[PDB]
Amino acid sequence: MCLKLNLLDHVFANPFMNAAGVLCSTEEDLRCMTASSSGALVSKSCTSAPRDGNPEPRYMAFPLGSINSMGLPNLGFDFYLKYASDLHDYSKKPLFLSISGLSVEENVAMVRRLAPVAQEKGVLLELNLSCPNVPGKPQVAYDFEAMRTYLQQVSLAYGLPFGVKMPPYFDIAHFDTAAAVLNEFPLVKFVTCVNSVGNGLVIDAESESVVIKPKQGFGGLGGKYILPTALANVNAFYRRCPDKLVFGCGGVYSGEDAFLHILAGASMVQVGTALQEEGPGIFTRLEDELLEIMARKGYRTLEEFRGRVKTIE
Amino acid sequence: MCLKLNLLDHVFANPFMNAAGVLCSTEEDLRCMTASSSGALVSKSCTSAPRDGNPEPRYMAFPLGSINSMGLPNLGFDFYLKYASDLHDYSKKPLFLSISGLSVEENVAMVRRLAPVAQEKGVLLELNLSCPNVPGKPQVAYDFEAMRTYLQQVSLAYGLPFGVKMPPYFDIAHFDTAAAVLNEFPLVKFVTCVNSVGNGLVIDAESESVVIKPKQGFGGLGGKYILPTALANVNAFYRRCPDKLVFGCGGVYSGEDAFLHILAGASMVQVGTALQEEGPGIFTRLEDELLEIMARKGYRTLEEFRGRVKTIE
Ligand SMILES: Cc1cc2nc3c(=O)[nH]c(=O)nc-3n(C[C@H](O)[C@H](O)[C@H](O)COP(=O)(O)O)c2cc1C
Ligand SMILES: Cc1cc2nc3c(=O)[nH]c(=O)nc-3n(C[C@H](O)[C@H](O)[C@H](O)COP(=O)(O)O)c2cc1C
Numbered sequence: 223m224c225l226k227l228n229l230l231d232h233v234f235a236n237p238f239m240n241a242a243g244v245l246c247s248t249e250e251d252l253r254c255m256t257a258s259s260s261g262a263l264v265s266k267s268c269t270s271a272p273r274d275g276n277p278e279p280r281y282m283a284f285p286l287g288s289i290n291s292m293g294l295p296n297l298g299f300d301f302y303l304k305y306a307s308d309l310h311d312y313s314k315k316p317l318f319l320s321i322s323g324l325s326v327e328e329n330v331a332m333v334r335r336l337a338p339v340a341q342e343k344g345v346l347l348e349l350n351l352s353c354p355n356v357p358g359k360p361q362v363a364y365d366f367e368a369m370r371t372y373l374q375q376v377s378l379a380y381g382l383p384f385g386v387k388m389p390p391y392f393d394i395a396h397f398d399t400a401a402a403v404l405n406e407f408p409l410v411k412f413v414t415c416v417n418s419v420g421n422g423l424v425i426d427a428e429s430e431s432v433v434i435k436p437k438q439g440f441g442g443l444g445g446k447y448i449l450p451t452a453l454a455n456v457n458a459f460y461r462r463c464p465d466k467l468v469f470g471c472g473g474v475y476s477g478e479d480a481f482l483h484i485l486a487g488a489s490m491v492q493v494g495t496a497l498q499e500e501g502p503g504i505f506t507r508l509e510d511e512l513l514e515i516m517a518r519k520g521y522r523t524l525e526e527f528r529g530r531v532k533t534i535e
Numbered sequence: 536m537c538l539k540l541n542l543l544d545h546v547f548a549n550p551f552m553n554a555a556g557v558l559c560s561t562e563e564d565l566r567c568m569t570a571s572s573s574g575a576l577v578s579k580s581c582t583s584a585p586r587d588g589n590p591e592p593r594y595m596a597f598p599l600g601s602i603n604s605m606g607l608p609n610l611g612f613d614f615y616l617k618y619a620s621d622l623h624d625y626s627k628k629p630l631f632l633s634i635s636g637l638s639v640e641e642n643v644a645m646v647r648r649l650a651p652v653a654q655e656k657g658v659l660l661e662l663n664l665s666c667p668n669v670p671g672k673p674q675v676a677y678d679f680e681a682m683r684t685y686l687q688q689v690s691l692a693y694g695l696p697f698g699v700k701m702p703p704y705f706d707i708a709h710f711d712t713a714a715a716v717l718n719e720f721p722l723v724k725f726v727t728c729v730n731s732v733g734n735g736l737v738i739d740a741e742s743e744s745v746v747i748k749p750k751q752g753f754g755g756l757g758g759k760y761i762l763p764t765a766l767a768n769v770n771a772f773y774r775r776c777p778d779k780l781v782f783g784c785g786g787v788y789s790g791e792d793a794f795l796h797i798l799a800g801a802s803m804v805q806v807g808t809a810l811q812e813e814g815p816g817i818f819t820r821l822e823d824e825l826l827e828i829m830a831r832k833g834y835r836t837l838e839e840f841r842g843r844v845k846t847i848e
């Protein structure tokens with residue numbers, strides 16, 4: 223019985239990794255994730271210049287999940303590139319580097335300089351599409367023409383397999399359109415579904431107040447709130463992108479939640495809110511819990527059940 | 536202390552009502568909702584002809600909420616119009632009638648017939664904008680040019696104050712565009728935020744199967760999953776539509792949750808999933824709970840706190 227996976231010309235001890243943004247901003251964070259039992263790690267989505275991000279409080283968690291408007295605080299691309307090129311121990315596990323430039327030219331400049339390190343050291347690029355374009359327009363992955371532009375330019379500049387982090391969609395016609403855009407780009411080898419559910423609002427009844435400061439308390443939701451939305455997106459893209467991998471992210475707190483993602487079609491399974499709340503010990507628990515479900519069902523490997531969710535009649 | 540209010544030239548004993556689709560499809564359902572302690576009731580969204588809806592199972596509920604792909608089963612518009620015209624006791628509470636035709640023409644046909652009954656009896660129209668659109672396009676409320684058309688054609692056909700039932704939005708640019716469309720129409724006097732969060736997917740780990748039969752298990756989410764989304768949309772539209780009322784719907788299971796909707800800006804609070812699960816006795820519990828929270832806080836009226844959610848600096 224084993225959780226091993228071999229994909230994208232790498233080997234993974236198990237499918238679990240951090241979600242981008244969680245436990246991955248500093249060298250300390252990345253060393254911590256490397257020391258953990260996760261099968262991989264991803265760095266904080268970065269910009270060319272360092273960013274302080276939004277005013278605090280900017281993250282809060284509750285029994286059913288979290289809300290955030292971090293504002294892309296990060297140490298800048300040069301830091302993350304140095305981590306990938308000089309500091310990371312690739313004999314421990316694979317590394318993904320997430321980018322989130324504020325324009326197509328910023329992403330193009332970063333991927334140009336990432337390429338040789340990707341080719342020499344094997345770092346993998348995750349391009350965050352659920353991200354800021356021109357203010358007053360929707361995030362990039364909610365603007366299908368912008369999404370296409372970003373993918374064309376990054377595919378030309380980078381020239382190597384990469385993947386994309388996608389916001390959730392809610393309408394079948396959007397699933398259709400988004401997957402069709404992705405399927406234009408053969409270098410898009412993985413699709414991570416999903417980023418936070420955008421612009422939720424948590425209010426504290428005792429204080430009659432929102433709980434985060436930026437954007438009058440509006441921010442992206444994660445955790446238990448979003449698991450059915452996450453599953454829907456993983457399965458939608460799994461069915462529509464037969465030549466790509468899907469990585470699942472959203473609502474994973476247990477091996478059972480991970481099993482559901484994998485039934486929906488997930489290859490790797492990323493953990494955000496629950497990892498932020500529990501810490502990196504979560505990965506030993508998730509491994510154990512997933513193995514127990516496999517043992518009860520007689521499954522020996524992940525491929526035996528990946529994407530095998532049954533439908534009714 | 537009592538929760539009575541006046542809106543839309545009607546008096547309401549309290550702000551609570553069923554959410555469209557729940558406990559409102561048949562004469563028996565409507566008589567049960569009328570008998571309840573709710574302040575108002577809304578009928579099942581209807582089409583010109585009766586519909587059987589989708590194959591069962593098509594609704595399932597869980598600790599965190601529900602999923603449905605009912606497919607608009609309903610008795611047909613002639614039934615709901617007769618209920619509004621001849622059967623409903625207006626001395627007990629106001630009635631809203633929800634329409635969801637499969638084209639703009641179908642809606643215009645139904646509203647031209649509802650107008651005289653609205654004049655004579657005071658039934659109120661809720662137009663469901665989660666309705667069918669042209670080939671390749673998303674639901675009407677997610678296609679702003681189609682929404683503008685529907686509202687223009689219904690406003691002209693109907694000629695009286697009405698409201699609209701909106702799906703959730705997840706992007707601040709979308710809130711800005713949708714509210715601007717709605718503010719083009721002075722007869723749109725109330726906005727109900729929100730319909731179900733579209734196309735989630737619930738999977739049972741034991742059986743490795745989706746839990747509803749239509750659409751390969753994909754359907755709209757309601758209940759605890761969607762409270763922060765519902766609050767965000769209520770407040771976004773409350774902020775953007777100062778000459779309209781906002782009705783809140785989504786995730787109400789307690790007086791506390793109702794309280795949060797009202798702080799966000801809700802004038803009426805609709806109850807879907809938790810009403811489906813608990814039955815119409817929920818209305819007395821929600822009233823008691825809301826009045827208890829008001830008493831502890833020293834609030835004597837809903838107006839004292841409606842829309843008064845606090846932001847941080
Ligand atoms: C504090 C915080 C920071 C995040 N920052 C990023 C980021 O930099 N890039 C990104 O792609 N997603 C980011 N996300 C989204 C997560 O990667 C993940 O998609 C989302 O939280 C849902 O997973 P969950 O339900 O396990 O939290 C962030 C989430 C949180 C909570
Ligand atoms: C079984 C079922 C049927 C519904 N049918 C309708 C409908 O006919 N018209 C409509 O506007 N919304 C319909 N909805 C959506 C609800 O009115 C409500 O917007 C949604 O369930 C979110 O509220 P909740 O969190 O209280 O469930 C339906 C919901 C359920 C669960």
Ligand SMILES: O=C(O)c1[nH]c(=O)[nH]c(=O)c1CCc1ccc(-c2ccccc2)cc1
Binds near residue numbers: 243322417418437
């Ligand atoms: O850094 C984040 O806030 C973030 N949080 C998420 O849940 N997912 C993400 O992908 C990111 C990074 C993308 C992002 C999100 C929000 C902003 C933002 C929000 C409010 C005001 C200013 C910036 C900028 C970039």
Ligand SMILES: O=C(O)c1[nH]c(=O)[nH]c(=O)c1CCc1ccc(-c2ccccc2)cc1
Binds near residue numbers: 580589663730749
């Ligand atoms: O009747 C519903 O399914 C329904 N459920 C909701 O949560 N919200 C609604 O507004 C509605 C009625 C709108 C609607 C939703 C789905 C369909 C549908 C779904 C699958 C296949 C055919 C029609 C038709 C109308």
